[PDB]
Design a protein around this ligand. Structure first.
Ligand SMILES: [Mg+2]
Ligand SMILES: [Mg+2]
Ligand SMILES: [Mg+2]
Ligand SMILES: [Mg+2]
Ligand SMILES: [Mg+2]
Ligand SMILES: [Mg+2]
Ligand SMILES: [Mg+2]
Ligand SMILES: [Mg+2]
Ligand SMILES: [Mg+2]
Ligand SMILES: [Mg+2]
Ligand SMILES: [Mg+2]
Ligand SMILES: [Mg+2]
Ligand SMILES: [Mg+2]
Ligand SMILES: [Mg+2]
Ligand SMILES: [Mg+2]
Ligand SMILES: [Mg+2]
Ligand SMILES: [Mg+2]
Ligand SMILES: [Mg+2]
Ligand SMILES: [Mg+2]
Ligand SMILES: [Mg+2]
Ligand SMILES: [Mg+2]
Ligand SMILES: [Mg+2]
Ligand SMILES: [Mg+2]
Ligand SMILES: [Mg+2]
Ligand SMILES: [Mg+2]
Ligand SMILES: [Mg+2]
Ligand SMILES: [Mg+2]
Ligand SMILES: [Mg+2]
Ligand SMILES: [Mg+2]
Ligand SMILES: [Mg+2]
Ligand SMILES: [Mg+2]
Lengths: 187, 53, 147, 128, 53, 148, 124, 53
RNA sequence: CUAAAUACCGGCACGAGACCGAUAGUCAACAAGUACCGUAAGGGAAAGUUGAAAAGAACUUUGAAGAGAGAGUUCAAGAGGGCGUGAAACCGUUAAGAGGUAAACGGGUGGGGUCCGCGCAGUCCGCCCGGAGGAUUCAACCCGGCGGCGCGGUCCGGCCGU
RNA sequence: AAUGCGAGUGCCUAGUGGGCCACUUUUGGUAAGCAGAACUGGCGCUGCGGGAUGAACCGAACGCCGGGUUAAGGCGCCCGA
RNA sequence: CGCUGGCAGUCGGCAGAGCGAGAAAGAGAGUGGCGCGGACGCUACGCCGCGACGAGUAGGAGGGCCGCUGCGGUGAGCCUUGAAGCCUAGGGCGCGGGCCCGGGUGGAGCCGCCGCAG
């Protein structure tokens, strides 16, 4: 026999979307054909992001879209979003934008179409640019979720700004012994 | 006091109503439900208002 | 769906996923939050710092309604009124400034966090913060107090 | 006048005996159906020499000849006459077994239709 | 899609009358059998009666 | 097997018994073959030994797959940038340890050899003790013909 | 679309039989009677069906016209072929190849039409 | 999709994730077909290694 | 002092069930808080099914009788008054095989049985050639019907457009 | 520098927390199949060939098979040689 | 298990049948000097091709066209020309959980598929 270790033989990664929704599963068929029949790596990234869970495609704000398409050089390009384009209401001016996304919310759609841009779906993007040329891939903040404040080094440890799990916050909710130099110690 | 009842979001209930209604105007989907509609003249089968009388 | 649970795959396995040596006994470390000082002290200090002790003053008949003061930042100041309120002042030439009543929308104190568009405002509020009134004066505007 | 299949490959079976349960011979309460032994000292699951064998995946039949009858056909359960027009285009690789709860009157009509559709029946003289 | 055809209203004798109604946009909604199943199998538990020993 | 010795036996790509590999010799190689000395039997191969080994047991590592060297295109597609385009170029770069010996030797899969016909002398002791382990200098070819 | 309603009918159709490690379809226009996207007789805009005639002899060939798709009463045109075993095999092949009507079903139609003519022969 | 529901308070028809769902006509379109590599449909089975010696 | 909205595993009368189906479901589907036990307070079971209809086996014969043998009923007594179906443990008999390392077992064969293949002259299919035949028969034209396609470069008229 | 290998990273998490044996080093004890350590490998969790037998020894680790060849052991007979 | 490999090109008288080959890229457009014919395929959750690997207690995960009972749908499902159940020196399939036929017994109900529930 051989002295190999079978601990990491099976890589965990997604081969297919776990969801059973048939409109996503047709776009998966389309970009699965495109990723193996083109040499463009854009179709591979889009196909891999179509597999992902809801937490792995966080929504973009319209303001983050404006700033990530306002950069020099990337004018007259198609912003490609795998998640959802949500409206961001703390911005007043919307320029015209050519948009490809899985979902666009109803008030963001109104603002984009009133600005004068276009909103595509992924089959429309596959028809327009099959190799995804003139596109800017964008993704939402993945650490934007509240779950990531409780992650990392444990609270009650020196130099660890990790949010603890409390039933409520207040004066007498975990603020005395591990937090005060008066009562006990402070990390 | 087992949880017998489930509550469903109103937008999803309406979404399922729309998906069930849009599937009733397609040939293959009503054939695959088994309904004998080979001689039905039109699949949105709409009749006149004296049927209520 | 009990057919999807772990129990249906544990039929035939003797210890039912709980171990041959250390059995699934009833309460092998106490009930509930037992031993926070004594034998669960490492968990209680490594995950819940500050749980034991007294901090601060007591307030006997505290009613939450007296300290009710909902806040709105200035980046949400223009969302309280309609869009044709905002664009009419932009197309306006006489310099008239629209009035935003945040107590009508359900806010008492105005804090100033975001930007303001370069157009005059008259903000009526129960309370103001200092940077909130300076960002309104800098864009050119009035901070009217109400009771 | 037997109905030949499309091809008749040689069927190789790695084991023809059943996989009997451990100690199904000393007791009537222990049926022949296989249960994997999970005892701490069980000499069968530890694979000691000269004991009852265990159903591994290595005993699996070849995929070309899997689920195939010794006549060279594969089997399909048939309840009525309508289920034979299902099988008429799969004629030279799949054959029909009339179900046990089908009466003799309908079973005559099923094999009568299968004769003209050239579909082989594994039990044509079943009930009569 | 977006193309809404013109369905014909049939009389009670089976033949087509002169009335035509455009196809409602409900019939072009997306077909989601997974959501229809999720709504159906959760709303079907709501008519149940309790049982206990 | 001792852990230090396991690491060196994996860096020599000898993960299975009766596996064989070509190793160029320097101080850094002799000080590793000394560590794995009781577990190996190494020596100095003949030109005919390299011919027999590459022609009969020659398998290439192409796209991390053990591919039999049945055509010269298989060598020339991977080692053609080092001007190694056939069996004869491969045998030359192995026998005369050239510039691209590391690439030519790493392209070859480790040699999956049979049990030695005739039999081993003594597996547990060194060759100079009338056994098998260690350095048999000119006599590795006698093991190569009976094992290949 | 055909793909869209195939994603509905691929597992929960009433024509589907799943037993004895095989799958089929009892669909009216499914020639070869198997459950697949290509051979499904109701999701496509252009379907070909080959069936026995109402009486003892002949082969009925059914196509689906392109105009009435939501109108199943007048959707399918039907022709009856009561001829010898070779001119019907030329005729159906002509109806598919020359009309370019769903051309990847021509040999399946010929193989079904041969089986119907064999079934309409006297048994031995 | 442009006029909201009048008997409900605030309901619209849901948006389509995929407008053109006929991926056969999508795939055999000249827009997509020109930007593809040649299909590698030749089957290369394993070669029985004869001993050259 | 004071109605209503609120509570209700007792009582009367009802309706329903993704509940259980006679070791289950109330202890209790039945002469069940009964039989029975304890001085007492109290404890507390087991127990459904012939058949469609008793048509519940007249009469003959042996035996003192229980029990049989005939006869008869029934679609059926292989349903005969604790009787629908009638498993396993255990036992009787028949048949087959075997037997001094308790029995049983895994692997590998061999022998004998029981049944099956409804085996015992051994597969058909397509094309072509040759030989004996038989049709109301082929191609090509004419008429009528239907379908497909149409960059009819851009024919006329409609419908729709997130 | 040589040799070899795709890596990096984040959540949730069961069981365990009685161990034992062997080469070498080593403490107490007259010693122990005794008590207590270090390193590595095993047994526990593991079948197989050999040591007649056998937790740990020697060889070698295991999907179901056919052919060939070996390891540690052996080749009077049991019992292959 | 990996190659996060290949196949929508079944592109047919509106035709020209290919992408295994050592060497980044197009069997590209234009501009000047008779016989009516061609296997299979593709449940894309499908099919196909290369390699490497396979011990297991406690434990964890996945797949079950394994099994029991009940509900919503569905098989123009099965059934007094015989259902459930039970027995069987009968024929088989599946690595296995188990399942399908044949004979007998029996006399009134039962099962397959898609989901749901215990
Ligand atoms: Mg192995
Ligand atoms: Mg392992
Ligand atoms: Mg792992
Ligand atoms: Mg276990
Ligand atoms: Mg236990
Ligand atoms: Mg557990
Ligand atoms: Mg414990
Ligand atoms: Mg517990
Ligand atoms: Mg203490
Ligand atoms: Mg043990
Ligand atoms: Mg020899
Ligand atoms: Mg040693
Ligand atoms: Mg009072
Ligand atoms: Mg009711
Ligand atoms: Mg009871
Ligand atoms: Mg009972
Ligand atoms: Mg009874
Ligand atoms: Mg009876
Ligand atoms: Mg009876
Ligand atoms: Mg009855
Ligand atoms: Mg009885
Ligand atoms: Mg006897
Ligand atoms: Mg313990
Ligand atoms: Mg000790
Ligand atoms: Mg281990
Ligand atoms: Mg061992
Ligand atoms: Mg000894
Ligand atoms: Mg061998
Ligand atoms: Mg001996
Ligand atoms: Mg394993
Ligand atoms: Mg028996």
């Amino acid at each position: 026999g051989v002295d190999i270790r079978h601990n990491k033989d099976r890589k965990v990664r997604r081969k297919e979307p776990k969801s059973q929704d048939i409109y996503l599963r047709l776009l998966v068929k389309l970009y699965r054909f495109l990723a193996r029949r083109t040499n463009s790596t854009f179709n591979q990234v889009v196909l891999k992001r179509l597999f992902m869970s809801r937490t792995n495609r966080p929504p973009l704000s319209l303001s983050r879209m404006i700033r990530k398409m306002k950069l020099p050089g990337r004018e007259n390009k198609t912003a490609v979003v795998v998640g959802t384009v949500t409206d961001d209401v703390r911005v007043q001016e919307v320029p015209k934008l050519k948009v490809c996304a899985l979902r666009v919310t109803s008030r963001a759609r109104s603002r984009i179409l009133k600005a004068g841009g276009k909103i595509l779906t992924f089959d429309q993007l596959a028809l327009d640019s099959p190799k995804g040329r003139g596109t800017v891939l964008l993704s939402g903040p993945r650490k934007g979720r509240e779950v990531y404040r409780h992650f990392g080094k444990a609270p009650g440890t020196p130099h660890s700004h990790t949010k603890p799990y409390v039933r409520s916050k207040g004066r007498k909710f975990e603020r005395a012994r591990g937090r005060r130099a008066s009562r006990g110690y402070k990390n | 006091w087992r949880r017998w009842h489930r509550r469903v979001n109103t937008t999803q209930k309406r979404y399922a109503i729309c998906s069930a209604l849009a599937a009733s105007a397609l040939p293959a989907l009503v054939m695959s439900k088994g309904h004998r509609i080979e001689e039905v003249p039109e699949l949105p089968l709409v009749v006149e208002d004296k049927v209520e009388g | 769906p009990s057919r999807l649970r772990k129990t249906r795959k544990l039929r035939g396995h003797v210890s039912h996923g709980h171990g041959r040596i250390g059995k699934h006994r009833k309460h092998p470390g106490g009930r509930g939050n037992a031993g926070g000082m004594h034998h669960h002290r490492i968990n209680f200090d490594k995950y819940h710092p500050g749980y034991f002790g007294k901090v601060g003053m007591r307030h006997y008949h505290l009613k939450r309604n007296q300290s009710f003061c909902p806040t709105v930042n200035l980046d949400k100041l223009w969302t309280l009124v309609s869009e044709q309120t905002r664009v009419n002042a932009a197309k306006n030439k006489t310099g008239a400034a629209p009035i935003i009543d945040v107590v009508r929308s359900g806010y008492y104190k105005v804090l100033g966090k975001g930007k303001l568009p370069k157009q005059p405002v008259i903000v009526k509020a129960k309370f103001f913060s200092r940077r909130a009134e300076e960002k309104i004066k800098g864009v050119g505007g009035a901070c009217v107090l109400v009771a | 006048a037997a109905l030949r299949p499309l091809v008749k490959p040689k069927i190789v079976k790695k084991r023809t005996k059943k996989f009997i349960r451990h100690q199904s011979d000393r007791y009537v309460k222990i049926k022949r159906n296989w249960r994997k032994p999970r005892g701490i000292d069980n000499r069968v699951r530890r694979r000691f020499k000269g004991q009852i064998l265990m159903p591994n995946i290595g005993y699996g039949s070849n995929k070309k000849t899997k689920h195939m009858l010794p006549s060279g056909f594969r089997k399909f359960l048939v309840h009525n006459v309508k289920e034979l027009e299902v099988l008429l285009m799969c004629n030279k690789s799949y054959c029909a077994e009339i179900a046990h709860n089908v009466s003799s009157k309908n079973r005559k009509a099923i094999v009568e239709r299968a004769a003209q559709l050239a579909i082989r029946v594994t039990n044509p003289n079943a009930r009569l | 899609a977006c193309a809404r055809p013109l369905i014909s209203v049939y009389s009670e004798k089976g033949e087509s009358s002169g009335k035509n109604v455009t196809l409602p946009a409900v019939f072009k909604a997306p077909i989601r059998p997974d959501i229809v199943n999720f709504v159906h199998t959760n709303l079907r538990k709501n008519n149940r009666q309790p049982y206990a020993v | 097997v001792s852990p230090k010795v396991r690491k060196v036996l994996q860096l020599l790509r000898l993960r299975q018994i009766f596996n064989g590999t070509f190793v160029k010799l320097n101080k850094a190689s002799i000080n590793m073959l000394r560590i794995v000395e009781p577990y190996i039997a190494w020596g100095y191969p003949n030109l005919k030994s390299v011919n027999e080994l590459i022609y009969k047991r020659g398998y290439g590592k192409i796209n991390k797959k053990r591919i039999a060297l049945t055509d010269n295109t298989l060598i020339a597609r991977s080692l053609g940038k080092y001007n190694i385009i056939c069996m004869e170029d491969l045998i030359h770069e192995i026998y005369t340890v050239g510039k691209h010996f590391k690439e030519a030797n790493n392209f070859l899969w480790p040699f999956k050899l049979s049990s030695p016909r005739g039999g081993m002398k003594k597996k547990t002791t060194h060759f100079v003790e009338g056994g098998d382990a260690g350095n048999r200098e000119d006599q590795i070819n006698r093991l190569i013909r009976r094992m290949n | 679309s055909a793909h869209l309603q195939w994603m509905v009918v691929r597992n929960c159709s009433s024509f589907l039989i799943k037993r004895n490690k095989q799958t089929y379809s009892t669909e009216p226009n499914n020639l070869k009677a198997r459950n697949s996207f290509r051979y499904n007789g109701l999701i496509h805009r252009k379907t070909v069906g080959v069936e026995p005639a109402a009486d003892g002899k002949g082969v009925v060939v059914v196509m689906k016209r392109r105009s009435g798709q939501r109108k199943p009463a007048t959707s399918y045109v039907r022709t009856t072929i009561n001829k010898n075993a070779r001119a019907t095999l030329s005729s159906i092949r002509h109806m598919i190849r020359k009309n370019k009507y769903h051309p990847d079903l021509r040999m399946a139609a010929i193989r079904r039409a041969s089986a119907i003519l064999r079934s309409q022969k006297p048994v031995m | 999709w442009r006029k909201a529901a009048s008997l409900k308070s605030n309901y619209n028809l849901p948006m389509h994730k995929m407008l053109n769902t006929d991926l056969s006509r999508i795939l055999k379109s000249p827009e997509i077909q020109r930007a593809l590599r040649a299909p590698r449909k030749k089957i290369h089975r394993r070669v029985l290694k004869k001993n050259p010696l």
